[PDB]
Amino acid sequence: QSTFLFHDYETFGTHPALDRPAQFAAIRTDSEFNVIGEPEVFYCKPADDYLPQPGAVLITGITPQEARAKGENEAAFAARIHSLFTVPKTCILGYNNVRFDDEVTRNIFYRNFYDPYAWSWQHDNSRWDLLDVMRACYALRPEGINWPEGLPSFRLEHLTKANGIEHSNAHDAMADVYATIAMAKLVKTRQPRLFDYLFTHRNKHKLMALIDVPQMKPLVHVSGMFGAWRGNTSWVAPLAWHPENRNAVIMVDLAGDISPLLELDSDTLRERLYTAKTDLAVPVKLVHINKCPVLAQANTLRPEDADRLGINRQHCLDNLKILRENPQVREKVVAIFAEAPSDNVDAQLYNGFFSDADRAAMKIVLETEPRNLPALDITFVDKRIEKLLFNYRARNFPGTLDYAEQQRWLEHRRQVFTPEFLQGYADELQMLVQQYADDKEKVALLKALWQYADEIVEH
């Protein structure tokens, strides 16, 4: 039986790799979004070589102390998430999960020896993200839904309130999951046909049928990169598959001005594209077919819709004709992408993939009891594993370190908690206490954050 697994993370910071998760919540439903089973909610204990971003703690109201008292170590934390995510025929989804939550999942799995990718495709599993579904709905078929404005806001809280959906205790994983389910139900109800279209075209194979590179056939694309002033929508034309990533296609925004593509050379274009802020400026962008982007046949954007959004159909077709009569453009664009770090092992998930041999060895690591990890006599090819293993043991199984390893771990913490870092931390807390002296609830959270810094980082 196929099902949907709505989930959400509340973290101690903004970086998917460098910050740590605080709380996780997941809810399994059926094809109609009716809850099956019970809600899953648990916390993650923070390791002793990390301090939370104060701003994040003020948002969630979750202190390191609460998380430490209620949660499990990250290895156990990951174990549970991996179980929920590996149930067959599951569509793992959330709200803005493709751009944030999934990166957290990949890093948690990475740090704790689980495959960072398999969960999203094996056993007929797949993934989706309601954020872009809301944007496509607003841009193409607005009717039946109230949209917070002075431009369209797609923050979950705003959408729920604007549509009479009870969303109290926001920024609590559990509550956000319930609100996402509510939003999904709302859209499926008020815009059934668009909903199903987006759903059935989320997978790589159905997306592929829409992309016609040789002909440069136009498509409707919804991306936050286009900007709320255009409804995050435009007409794009695929120019070529990426030279080094066959899961990426180079698209040209037909609504922009293409002269830059005609006048400048590939070196210049590359400089401007590789350093610019991602906001549509060279009218070119990449679409990763494995990240469920919103793509639809051109006619989905009716003349009425174009006018409402401000998209000049004719202008787009004019550029389309030009691109077709100027083969040299396909050359320059592909040439641009024909050319593509940290010393912290936590930030090297994307340094490369692990060979089948290392995956096998890492699998044995997962079955080995912590006490025996040191005694384990396994070969590792990838240089990252050795470092990952040491952090894994020191962070989740401290009592397992020998005397010398404890000294090394102590040295490690000293190198993280440098004088400038502690001063910056105190400066921020000082600034926040001055700003929220009144709010008895916020001051309590700030007091806790300073106490926590005292015990984990002082002396």
Catalog residues that contact Mg ion under the rule CB under 5 A: 96
60 vs 232, beta carbon nearer Mg ion: 60
**455 annotated as a binding-site residue:** no
127 vs 330, beta carbon nearer Mg ion: 127
**196 annotated as a binding-site residue:** no
181 vs 345, beta carbon nearer Mg ion: 181
Q: Is 123 left (phi over 0), alpha (psi -120 to 50) or beta?
A: left
48 vs 176, beta carbon nearer Mg ion: 176
Least distance CB 252 / Mg ion (angstroms): 30
Least distance CB 44 / Mg ion (angstroms): 16
102 vs 253, beta carbon nearer Mg ion: 102
> Tokens 């605080």 identify what position?
22
**10 annotated as a binding-site residue:** yes
Least distance CB 187 / Mg ion (angstroms): 17
Residue 387 CB partners (closer than 8 Å, separation 6+): 345
* Contact indicator for 56, 13 with CB cutoff of 8 Å: yes
134 vs 240, beta carbon nearer Mg ion: 134
**106 annotated as a binding-site residue:** no
Tokens of 11: 């973290």
> Tokens 């604007």 identify what position?
162
Least distance CB 231 / Mg ion (angstroms): 22
Least distance CB 42 / Mg ion (angstroms): 17
Least distance CB 293 / Mg ion (angstroms): 18
Q: Partners of 28 in the beta sheet? A: 5
84 vs 429, beta carbon nearer Mg ion: 84
Least distance CB 418 / Mg ion (angstroms): 31
Closest residue (Cβ) to Mg ion?
96
Least distance CB 109 / Mg ion (angstroms): 17
25 vs 75, beta carbon nearer Mg ion: 25
90 vs 96, beta carbon nearer Mg ion: 96
C-beta atoms surrounding 437 within 10 Å: 11
Least distance CB 25 / Mg ion (angstroms): 11
96 vs 232, beta carbon nearer Mg ion: 96
> Tokens 């709320």 identify what position?
228
Question: Over the chain, what HEC string results?
Answer: CCEEEEEEEEECCCCCCCCCEEEEEEEEECCCCCECCCCEEEEECCCCCCCCCHHHHHHHCCCHHHHHHHCECHHHHHHHHHHHHCCCCEEEEECCCCCCHHHHHHHHHHHCCCCCCHHHCCCCCEEEEHHHHHHHHHHHCCCCCCCCCCCCCCCHHHHHHCCCCCCCCCCCHHHHHHHHHHHHHHHHHHCHHHHHHHHHCCCHHHHHHHCCCCCCCCEEEECHHHCHHHCCEEEEEEEEECCCCCCEEEEEECCCCCHHHHHCCHHHHHHHHHHCCCCCCCCEEEEECCCCCEEEEHHHCCHHHHHHHCCCHHHHHHHHHHHHHCCHHHHHHHHHHCCCCCCCHHHCHHHCCCCHHHHHHHHHHHHCCHHHCCCCCCCCCCCHHHHHHHHHHHHHCHHHCCHHHHHHHHHHHHHHCCHHHHHHHHHHHHHHHHHCCCCHHHHHHHHHHHHHHHHHHCC
Taking the C-alpha atoms of residue 295 and residue 391, their distance in angstroms, rounded to an integer, is 41
Least distance CB 232 / Mg ion (angstroms): 18
Residue ranges of the annotated binding site for substrate are 10, 155
Residue ranges of the annotated binding site are 8, 10, 155, 176
Residue ranges of the annotated binding site for Mg(2+) are 8, 10, 176
